[PDB]
Design a protein around this ligand. Structure first.
Ligand SMILES: Nc1ncnc2c1ncn2[C@@H]1O[C@H](COP(=O)(O)OP(=O)(O)OP(O)(O)=S)[C@@H](O)[C@H]1O
Ligand SMILES: [Mg+2]
Ligand SMILES: [Zn+2]
Lengths: 629, 512, 89
């Protein structure tokens, strides 16, 4: 092949002239080392150095690869295998056709099975048994001492879930790894393999050479920075993540927190502390539960959805199946281990049998799954966050029975969920009006009735940037957590050390949300409410111009705390303090006059209806009723 | 001549494929059409040569990947799959059918690359008639038996084996993977026996203007709705509301995609539950619906995994529910069914999808079906009680998922028995045959959309309905019913009449 | 960067013209930033309008197909794009 010789000369040219320092000189010198025998070459450097050579290599990779190795050996000997990386085109397994044979392409998939290392003979020195003639350098078409052997590994891969078309069985492909590529891949991992599709006697097999697992653009980086400085980022994210769901914002906050997640810690004793959050949702049929599952599935690319009763114990964690060709026993992956470092959603968790939940037990807490079946002994990682949805024993939450009687869940299962929300459906006219108008507006105005503060891709980028930080816990947060847990545990769902660990994880998640390198007690105060609330209504009723019950309690708490602090005042002075404190939120004169109206009404109402404030004789003195805590 | 414009379009796109309608050939030349039918394998090369010569004469500077190939389609021989005879061997045939399974990519050699073992002299051999013309001497050194075949250097053609519902179909090259199992295709190809069919072309409006005019004339009648209700099941007496509900289910709702909203694809197909004594019009009505509706399914009280005997691989088989996708599935004796199946029904009733996680097999399936179920009360008699569960013992979830629930009670009224007996002893045609095509036209052409007046009406209806107890799912069902009634009038907009009729029917069902 | 990716895709596909759907899907599946198909379509339209000599669009039947000149120097195109961006500033 004359073009092969031309390609060899051009490859020598690239190796000898690419630069102001030649990148590959040090790598070639390191190739002299016996443990190093493959050279990694970037494809972008090849295409920028010259285009005809790049196209020829991309088109006739199998034709010129041994010539590339000859060029590499010649270049090294003047002072071996060739590997390529950074091909800019990604392909799908279903795209693999016979027209692409011999093309240098890279494929993305998930490793499901692995095979041990085997020696492969490339060139064999044969001794004739008739005339004792030594025949050397005999290539193989697919004396051991003087022959050449190369390490081999066989890899079986499976199609990714995202690329899998609905109703299609994920096809499997065999991958051959040699020399340094051997043992570089592990079962259960998702990898991108660079190489060619060869024809085995026919049969389809892909030969691979390499594996795959500050620099962001200025405007994306600046948009992330600017949005990281937003004071209302928490509420804006809560609204944007569920634009079409009315009310029930507590579940929104909880799912956002579990998306953020905490940090895992491994003790010096080798014990690992879970840095994830598990959430359970139990509610009457009316309240939307599956919608949250669908939203978190469509938003997070690493989310897996499954049904309750249709899933067996083997299908969730793993199963032991005898391999047809090997005549041995192997392990087929389950749903939980495929959701590694992701989120797994289970619908109708109640319908599942106890024989399945007992299998779930280990993955829930110990975060790993172990199998000791039929002479197969192994342990597998199950680093997952579980979001479960279920209904009470009866379709209707019967108040004639106690709370414990209404939930048919085992005590450890109840304990191992960090956040546990219970939804009760009530007949309220204003809630009915709001729900009806939202539903009809969505049905008639599909696109124009959506106002998202931030784009979903922007939220994903911010979440990716935020998750890699590991905030530190401060001493003030330390003693605040101590006293808060003291008060909390002193009061069915018993509160054990597991809840304390969940509280620490929630504080860490709040710290990661705000991009703060240290944890502050404000996060602890925020998480304390969410841990306390438990049973939660759809929406709180209005209070007479109307104001929310939570805001009313917030104002009352702030004013009582300030008065009690000052004890160790005057109406106008206290109003002036409040306007000084709320200055960070008001942006217009109309908001100021509205706030003045609200605070005057609240002070008068507390004075004359709730009796928590006592008037003492135009600027009367105000004192706190001594029985408010 | 449309063929010159076709050639120009091919020149613009560069795809060397010609689709030729056999009726044009028959009209132009009957003898040539007969020759094409009798000996397609000999006239197709001549057609290819002629079209290639014409194209090269018109545009000689064409850099074509391959020579232009002619693919005739829609031959007169639309013979049934069961009507094949030994007489039409090596003749063109057109068959419509359902695709069950498609094999993987099978490479077939078309050019053999041989290299000399001494001087590396290379040669190419065309694969002909299933035999390899392996060279025996070298072209340079003339050494005998020095040729080596390289599989990688050789040229491969993709071929696929397809099972059609049975006959075996062989797609080659471009035709491979163009058809997905579960679709109806018109396959045109040459009949050959070893029996098999070699695919040449795949084929995957139906009303004249007079039919559309007649449909419009009927729709302009304000009584068409009640007239069609009278037309449905003539042998069934005094169940006009049930026939109205059946017709509304047949029309169904309109499909909407919520991809921009981030929400899942909402169900837009209506399900109706029937409960009553056995021996009533349940079985007859279910059989009538199953026979009348195309792609209907009848079942009595899912997907499964099959071994491939060839590759030892576990393949999937589709149950009646999956096979009835975009169709109507009817079930008898709903109460007498196992709880395991009814638990599975919740997913198909709600999300229209189905997920399986067993033995490492994880898959999701589309299950766009409408369920018409018949159930028997547990007492086998309408015991005087309050809730339907007290007589039928069904969970709240399944009942809430049903859009319409109807109860068949045999009244203890003498006149009703007289009318029943007279109907039996005494036991229209212009309507159902036209109605099948009319329903097809309504499904294909029109889709209604909601209005502001209907918005206010539905909001008030919901706020009044909850006072009786009500879930938002019944509001969704009311929207679907309004869409169905709008489709009944062939009106592109939902108005007050649709909402009022839907609310009336729902309140009548609740009262009953 | 998107222009470079498009050039590489057309090198890989061995085809003179490609449809909007396949090209946009491949670019999204190969791009470093997650983007919607509509954004990719508007970016392709902007590239066509700014630089018509390199990139041409043809409306056939009910679809628009994309044809590109593979012999153009990428460095010169990058310089021209930088000049256009500076002018737009
Ligand atoms: N706050 C809400 N905002 C908008 N739509 C709602 C709201 N609450 C309920 N809905 C509607 O009610 C439907 C019920 O949602 P689901 O999540 O399926 O209910 P569910 O509680 O999960 O009941 P199951 O478990 O599926 S039987 C939703 O699809 C919405 O159409
Ligand atoms: Mg649900
Ligand atoms: Zn020779």
């Amino acid at each position: 092949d004359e073009v092969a010789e031309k390609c060899q000369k051009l490859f020598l040219d690239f190796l000898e002239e690419f630069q102001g320092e030649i990148k590959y000189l040090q790598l070639a010198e390191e190739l002299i080392r016996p443990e190093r025998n493959t050279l990694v070459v970037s494809f972008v450097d090849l295409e920028q150095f010259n285009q005809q050579l790049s196209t020829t290599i991309q088109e006739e990779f199998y034709r010129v690869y041994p010539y590339l190795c000859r060029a590499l050996k010649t270049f090294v000997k003047d002072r071996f295998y060739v590997a390529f990386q950074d091909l800019p085109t990604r392909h799908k397994i279903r795209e693999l056709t016979s027209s692409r044979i011999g093309l240098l392409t890279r494929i993305s998939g998930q490793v499901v099975r692995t095979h041990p290392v085997h020696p492969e003979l490339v060139s064999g020195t044969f001794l004739c048994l008739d005339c004792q003639t030594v025949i050397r350098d005999v290539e193989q078409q697919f004396d051991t001492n003087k022959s050449r052997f190369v390490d081999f590994q066989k890899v079986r891969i499976q199609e990714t879930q995202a690329e899998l078309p609905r109703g299609s069985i994920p096809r499997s492909l065999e991958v051959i790894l040699r020399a340094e590529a051997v043992e570089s891949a592990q079962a259960g991992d998702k990898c991108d393999f660079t190489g060619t599709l060869i024809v085995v006697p026919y049969r389809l097999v892909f030969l691979a050479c390499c594996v795959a697992p500050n620099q962001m653009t200025v405007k994306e980086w600046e948009k992330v920075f600017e949005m990281s400085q937003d004071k209302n980022l928490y509420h804006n994210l809560c609204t944007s993540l569920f634009p079409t769901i009315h009310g029930n914002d507590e579940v929104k906050r909880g799912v956002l927190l579990m998306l953020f997640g905490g940090v895992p810690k491994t003790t010096g004793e080798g014990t690992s502390l879970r840095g994830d959050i598990n959430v359970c949702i139990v509610g009457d049929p009316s309240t939307a539960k599956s919608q949250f599952l669908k939203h978190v599935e469509e938003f997070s690319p690493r989310a897996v959805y499954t049904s309750g009763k249709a899933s067996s114990a083997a299908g969730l964690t793993a199963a032991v199946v005898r391999d047809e060709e090997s005549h041995e026993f192997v392990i087929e992956a389950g749903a939980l281990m495929l959701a590694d470092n992701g989120v797994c959603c289970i619908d109708e968790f109640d319908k599942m049998d106890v024989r399945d939940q007992v299998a779930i037990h280990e993955a829930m807490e110990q975060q790993t799954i172990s199998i000791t079946k039929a002479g197969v002994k192994a342990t597998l990682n199950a680093r997952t966050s579980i979001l479960a949805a279920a209904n009470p024993i009866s379709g209707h939450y019967d108040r004639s029975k106690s709370l414990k009687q209404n939930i048919n869940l085992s005590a450890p299962i109840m304990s191992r969920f960090d956040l546990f929300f219970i939804l009760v459906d009530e007949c309220n006219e204003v809630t009915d009006y709001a729900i009806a108008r939202r539903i009809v507006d969505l049905h008639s105005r599909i696109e124009e009735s959506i106002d998202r503060v931030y784009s979903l891709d922007d939220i994903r980028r911010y979440l990716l940037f935020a998750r890699q930080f590991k905030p530190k816990i401060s001493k003030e947060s330390e003693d605040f957590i101590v006293e808060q847990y003291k008060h909390l545990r002193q009061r069915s769902w018993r509160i054990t050390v597991r809840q304390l660990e969940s509280m620490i994880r929630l504080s860490e998640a709040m710290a990661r949300m705000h991009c703060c390198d240290e944890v502050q007690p404000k996060h602890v105060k925020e998480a304390f409410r969410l841990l306390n609330k438990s049973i939660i209504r759809v929406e709180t009723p209005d209070v007479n111009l109307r104001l929310g019950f939570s805001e009313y309690c917030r104002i009352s708490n702030l004013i009582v705390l300030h008065l009690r602090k000052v004890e160790e005042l005057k109406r106008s002075e206290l109003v002036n303090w409040y306007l000084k404190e709320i200055e960070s939120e008001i942006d217009s004169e109309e908001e100021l006059i509205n706030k003045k109206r609200i605070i005057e009404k609240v002070i008068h109402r507390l004075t004359h209806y709730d009796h928590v404030l006592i008037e003492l004789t135009e600027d009367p003195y105000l004192v706190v009723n001594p029985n408010y805590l | 001549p449309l063929y010159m414009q076709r050639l120009g379009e091919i020149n613009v796109i560069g795809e060397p494929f010609l689709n030729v309608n056999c009726e044009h050939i028959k009209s132009f030349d009957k003898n040539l059409y007969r020759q094409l039918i009798s000996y397609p394998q000999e006239v197709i090369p001549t057609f290819d040569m002629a079209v290639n010569e014409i194209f090269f004469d018109r545009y000689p500077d064409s850099i074509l990947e391959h020579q232009i190939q002619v693919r005739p389609f829609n031959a007169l021989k639309t013979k049934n799959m069961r009507n094949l005879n030994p007489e039409d061997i090596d003749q063109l045939i057109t068959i419509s059918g359902m695709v069950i399974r498609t094999s993987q990519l099978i490479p077939e050699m078309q050019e053999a690359f041989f290299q000399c073992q001494v001087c590396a002299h290379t040669t190419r051999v065309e694969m002909d008639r299933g035999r390899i013309a392996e060279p025996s001497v070298c072209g340079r050194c003339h050494t005998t038996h020095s040729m080596a075949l390289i599989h990688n250097r050789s040229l491969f053609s993709d071929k696929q084996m397809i099972k059609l519902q049975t006959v075996i179909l062989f797609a080659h090259n471009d035709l491979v993977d163009k058809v997905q199992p579960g679709d109806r295709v018109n396959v045109t190809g040459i009949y050959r026996a070893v029996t098999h069919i070699d695919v040449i072309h795949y084929r995957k409006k139906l009303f004249s203007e007079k039919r559309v005019e007649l449909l419009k004339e009927l729709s302009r009648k304000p009584d068409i709705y009640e007239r069609l209700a009278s037309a449905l099941a003539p042998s069934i007496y005094e169940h006009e509301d049930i026939k109205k509900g059946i017709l509304l289910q047949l029309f169904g709702g309109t499909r909407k995609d919520f991809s921009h909203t981030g929400r899942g694809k909402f169900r837009a197909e209506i399900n109706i539950l029937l409960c009553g004594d056995p021996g009533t019009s349940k079985s007859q009505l279910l059989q009538y619906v199953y026979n009348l509706v195309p792609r209907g399914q009848y079942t009595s009280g899912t997907a499964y995994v099959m071994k491939d005997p060839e590759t030892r691989q576990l393949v999937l088989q589709t149950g009646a529910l999956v096979l009835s996708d975009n169709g109507i599935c009817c079930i008898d004796e709903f109460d007498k069914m196992n709880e395991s199946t009814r638990s599975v029904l919740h997913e198909v009733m709600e999300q229209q999808t189905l997920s399986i996680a067993k033995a490492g097999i994880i898959c999701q399936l589309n299950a766009r079906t409408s369920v018409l179920a018949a159930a028997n009360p547990i007492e086998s008699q309408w015991n005087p009680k309050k809730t339907t569960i007290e007589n039928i013992q069904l969970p709240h979830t399944l009942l809430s998922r049903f859009d319409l629930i109807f109860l068949m009670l045999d009244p203890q009224d003498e006149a009703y028995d007289r009318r029943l007996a007279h109907h039996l002893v005494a036991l229209e045609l212009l309507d159902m045959a036209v109605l099948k095509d009319y329903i097809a036209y309504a499904h294909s052409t029109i889709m209604p959309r909601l209005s502001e007046e209907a918005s206010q009406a539905l909001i008030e209806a919901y706020v009044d309905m909850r006072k009786i107890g009500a879930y938002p799912r019944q509001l969704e069902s009311l929207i679907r019913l309004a869409e169905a009634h709008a489709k009944v009038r062939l009106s592109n907009k939902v108005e007050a009449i649709d909402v009022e009729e839907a609310k009336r029917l729902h309140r009548e069902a609740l009262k009953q | 960067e998107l222009a470079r990716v498009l050039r590489s895709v057309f090198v890989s596909e061995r085809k003179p013209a490609l449809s909007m759907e396949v090209a946009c899907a491949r670019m999204v599946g190969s791009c470093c930033t997650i983007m919607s198909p509509g954004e990719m379509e508007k970016h392709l339209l902007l590239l066509s309008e700014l630089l018509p000599d390199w990139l041409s669009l043809h409306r056939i039947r009910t679809d628009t197909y994309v044809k590109l000149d593979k012999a153009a120097d990428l460095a010169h195109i990058t310089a021209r794009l930088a000049h256009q961006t500076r002018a737009e500033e």
